[PDB]
Subunit: 362 residues, 5 copies
């Protein structure tokens, strides 16, 4: 047990086998659920005090809710005794996800008054996946009508575009946001025996043709269909996220690029005990850009079963954040980045997006 | 004596026998009533400067008023010469309780424009108990029509639910919020010879199934009837509050669990002189969560006639709060928690909820 | 002899009316009130309150601040005939500002209604009514005559229709000091018009001497609450000082009776007789608790009762720590000790007695 | 050349004879005109960044613009090569003067939504005078209709009032504000051959009646028609401003009171090297009240051709304000008062209000 | 390589031959493009977080956007592999340029609700050049309709005025703002084969006879048609900007005045290694007024092929601003003026306004 760590990497990877979350993961669930009014998963309502206290920028809240929801789905898998709870939290996640505080930047930016009609795939992709994960966990048909509507919007929009996928802001295409949307199609198919996921092959072909540097195993920052532009910089956090979720749809894809990605962005240090991730090429700096390179790589390492890298990244990320457990509840005194406890939570419990996809009934 | 205590425990428990409140209680009543414009009970108006000066969060104001009200009800029982004053203050309590500042979080959260028509038992439970306590204290029929209306709302909603009781926010069930509502049914019955309280039996049975840990004498945090989830943490403040209220309706219920509760949560320290209460299991930390576990156990100790625990808790709670009496009015320089002077006032004077329920007329 | 931080002697203040001249520091207070464009409190009839913002007056207190200036001004007019025109001008501005929504708006914000004079709210409309009258008394102007008569009718009818003697402030809140202002306003109206609205005063003085006063301690209780019959069980010095002072203008024997009991209950002489402090309530040693105005209003009461020794003692307590200075012939205080500080010190230095204001010569 | 001074007094008084402004006056025109967006005369639009930067209070902006305008009118008279610039700036001045940022205090105070209809001579007096000076300087008829409209309003209001002149705020009469309005009438007559200025004799008679203290040669602060009150304090800045403008209409008037004014208010110090001005009587403090006594006396000294007092006042005002010229543009590090660079500019170029009236016609 | 410099002047002037931008220019494009939400060219929405982080005053945003855009047009000409990206960024520039946050000052100042209808050539001149440069780079007709509408407005307004050109604020005439407008006509003619540029000769004759001091090679500050007033100060930033753009339309004109301009305003110092520019005559102070003399003279030196002055100016401007490259992205610790990174960016890549006019079709 490394100094400033709460549990061993072995303990995290063993949770499914044990059918029990680690104590610190339980304490994170306590943070998420325990205290009236200010815990993030206290209420269905449009109250965002937990995110206010964390100083989460408005635009980041949707992702915060999304990654919490994904971690919750894995908890449901790990411990049957917490599955009812995880499902309750997922219900709340979907409710909050639909509040105007969360999706409102779309309207404020001038893009329209409806966040799902088109193009907000950074938002509606996550929402569609959450609809799905909720139903897999709980078997409830509470959101089935909305799930169907949103899934058709997504499929149709994919089908109509000359490129494979959907944009975020108009004329902005992000490979990582698309992989949420496609993953959500796989989940809808599992629930209903449909074949929306058929679109995935063209998408995987497309992103491999111009959006990736195959040699370095890294995706370019973004693509912009009307100009044809592919932004010249490769992005680690973008690649880590995308490979993690693609791994749940096409494992050979991610297994192909994963060791090249590591070669390109990952800096092991401190005699092998720790690792840092560079955000782009031509630099020595770790976690530039949005600062999420190391955290998303922590999730990718978990998805790929790479326990050594996971242990290395966590040894870098968690200790300076200064974790403590007070009254059986987890706090970080110095969160190192945006989405910090969210991504650390997700990575600690992540069962694989492939496993989430094929979740047992009840 | 101890140091920073204002009166002995024997003195607080003797108030009803002596038909006189202690001087620190009178000094608390002065804080509540004395200074123009800024004392809590200055006018029926929708002005909350007293609460602004205390930095009371908006969501907590409804509870502050309610617990002031319950304490004033006992004051009425203790000293006949103060019963008119207590009744006046209860009249102001009810009026302020109905101000949008107090219940407006229900509408801001997106739950509805009307705070009593469905759910929201956290608010309308207290309001209905207050309607009844005002009438018991004063004999006045000023709110009788509103009282009948809300009592029937609560009665109908109980009858209509598959689970025993009523939710607060949609799909959030709390045992302590329900105990207020049921107790309000008993008060209505006492005033009108009705039998709304018959529903209590089913409620007491229900909360003793999945909502309690019978051996530890501790309730779980909450229940969520849509998903069936019971949140896996036991909660001291929740249990102390619930047992205190239930003791006025089914004393054997509370008498049965009270010693186990103490075993579970209460830490005696300083060679028997003091006591502090853990909020949940699996920690050594006292007063986590909302931080009210000791303050509510103080009220419970009073309700159960446990003078030893009362004394121990007050020695923990009151001295670090640095009480002073300036111009015959009580102030605490460092309130240790939310609802601090409200809960200490209430505990000091509390005659027992059964006694309040059987209050003789004016 | 002039105490160490004082601006003028007590003898000088009590002599002003005799010499027909305000003291220099009273004149400098009037400069503060009138001199500097835009920010002086009596600069214009407009609904600007920058003077009060610069003083950090809380909103609910502005009406009282305006009212107590007005009462001081009425005495300046009685003291110095050359300043009577000025005094009347400031009273004109006081009435105008009194009617601005910034001043009475708390009534609507507390949910009590959109019209501040229609019913109740005697804490506001009592003062307004007295000010209407003092204005016409001082100036002879009939500018506010129509609304003066209208409000006097409101107050008269409200008193007639209430089971208890008087009128509430907030609904179900009855305050003896606020009522004293309203009744006095009826005396002023009668002085102006020869009428007999003041006839209700007898029943009121009988009422408040029942459950509202502790006759032995010469002190009023905090408040009365008619729907429950409650009388708050604390006696209040500022309440009593203010009430006795204004009642002395209508029934001087009432205040003669309770004044020495009041002093025994509340007043603490200290510093070898040189100073005095006023305790706000019973059962405490602490001075000026509660609203913090006990000493300030007793200062007014001492003036009204001609008690120069007590006046001198309180002013020695109140004025020096506040550090008065005169800059460019205008008075400032560096550390005002309480709300309404320069208002009440001004009023007490010029106060001619409410009875004498009633007998003010015509023009 | 004293330290902290930019040019000699001789240099300022010689500008007109030499047909050129001094270099510091040019540097001041640069501050006024040079920098995109933030210079005060950059744009005709309703932008007030320059005044925000100087922390000009909203109520004072109208006087700032106006005093700039009066100085620009003298620049036109001093230097024919700057007359086009001067006129362009005066165009902008009139245009900004009409923005709601500038006159809106009239509506906020609750005095009405139209700032020229009645009263408010503090605002529309300067506006009318500016309309006039703009047209004297440029010959442009851009504002003729508005100018004629306002001039009739002002004329009809004077004709209708019992007192000679027009109030500012309701029931507030100020002589200095009236002096601008009357001067604006002289300018209108000079442009149009009319005789609106005929009302000046009645006005000069009236202000000499109860508004002035003959011995001290000083006006009282203000007059209030309703109560008849005349505020009992004399004001230096009020007198300086008024005597300067009246000197343009009736020089014997200002000549009669000027030496009296100086004995009352002006303190020469530093062995005759400096002077400063007291704001009211019975104080030794200089520049109390609004703090403009010295700055306006500087203008008065110029108007009266009193080079010695001008030099003394400027030695008092300019050095501690730390003038520097950076990139050919004037800045003061520590302006000692409101309207500081406006009033120093105006005093440094002022050709006399009488000379402004007799301006040679436009091409 | 001088101390504090990122690249040699040789390197900047060689970019077009190498068909590659220097690494620091690429790091500037990263600042403009890389980080989600906060980079200035992230999306075409009406969000200006980038400029809020820079504390760009509102009135200055439009020139920021315009000078970025001109910079991007030269990137497109320099590096074919970056032309698609340059096109995408220009699309975003035009989009944000039309946002009310950018032109709104026109309405707030009381000048009207329509920012292009009449006057305001300071805004719509830049907009019109940007329309054309966008279409030159991309070939897209996305804005062609509004380009034609605005070009006609400018054309009709020039034809209707007694003086040659168009005012900014009513009655305010600026030679630099007019120069942008005339250049925009040349760009429109290149795209459509029209002859709008014919009005240029009358403009050049007029500004040369009336608004320039031929001896000093310097334009006066501004002209005011109604009063006939010409502000009596000459302005370096005004002149540097105007000669730079005129050089794209009439190279002989600017060549005539350029050596005189430098004589008047440019101070060489530090043994010929640095230079700084006085904003006006009769002073020794450099960069007074708007503080842009040196930065615009840097652009002008680039336009005129003057590598010596370019190097001297850049040695003055860049080192005290303390450039650094973090995570392959350029940041200045201490920008010495408004529009700082925009104008250094533009000067470093600027291929000449004449070269832009002759841009190959893609
Ligand atoms: Cl946390
Ligand atoms: Cl105690
Ligand atoms: Cl308290
Ligand atoms: Cl004061
Ligand atoms: Cl300045
Ligand atoms: Cl930068
Ligand atoms: K609760
Ligand atoms: K009161
Ligand atoms: K004035
Ligand atoms: K410009």
């Amino acid at each position: 047990l490394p100094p400033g760590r709460l549990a061993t990497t072995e303990d995290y990877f063993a949770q499914q086998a044990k059918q029990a979350v680690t104590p610190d993961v339980m304490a994170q669930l306590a943070y998420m659920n325990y205290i009236d009014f200010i815990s993030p998963f206290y209420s269905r309502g449009c109250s965002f005090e937990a995110w206010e206290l964390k100083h989460t920028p408005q635009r980041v809240i949707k992702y915060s809710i999304a990654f919490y929801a994904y971690g919750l789905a894995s908890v449901a898998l790990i411990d049957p005794k917490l599955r009812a709870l995880a499902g309750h939290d997922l219900d709340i996640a979907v409710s909050k996800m639909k509040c105007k505080r969360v999706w409102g930047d779309w309207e404020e930016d001038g893009f329209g008054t409806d966040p799902i009609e088109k193009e907000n795939i950074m938002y509606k992709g996550h929402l569609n996946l959450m609809y799905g994960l909720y139903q897999l966990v709980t078997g409830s048909r509470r959101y089935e009508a909305e799930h169907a509507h949103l899934t058709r919007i997504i499929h149709d929009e994919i089908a109509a575009n000359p490129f494979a996928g959907i944009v975020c802001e108009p004329d902005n295409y992000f490979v990582q946001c698309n992989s949420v949307a496609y993953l959500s199609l796989w989940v809808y198919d599992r629930l209903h025996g449909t074949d929306y996921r058929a679109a995935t092959r063209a998408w995987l072909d497309f992103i491999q043709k111009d959006l990736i540097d195959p040699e370095r195993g890294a995706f370019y920052l973004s693509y912009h269909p009307e100009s044809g532009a592919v932004k010249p910089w490769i992005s680690a956090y973008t690649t880590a996220w995308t490979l993690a979720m693609v791994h749940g749809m096409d494992p050979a894809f991610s297994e192909r690029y994963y060791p090249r990605f590591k070669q390109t962005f990952v800096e092991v240090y401190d005699e092998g005990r720790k690792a840092r991730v560079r955000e782009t090429a031509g630099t020595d700096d770790a976690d530039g850009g949005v600062g999420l390179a190391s955290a998303f790589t922590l999730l990718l390492a978990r998805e790929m079963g790479d326990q050594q890298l996971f242990d290395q990244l966590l040894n870098h990320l968690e200790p300076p954040a200064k974790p403590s457990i007070v009254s059986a509840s987890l706090r970080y005194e110095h969160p190192g980045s945006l989405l910090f406890d969210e991504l650390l939570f997700l990575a600690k419990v992540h069962a694989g997006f492939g496993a989430l996809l094929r979740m047992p009934p009840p």
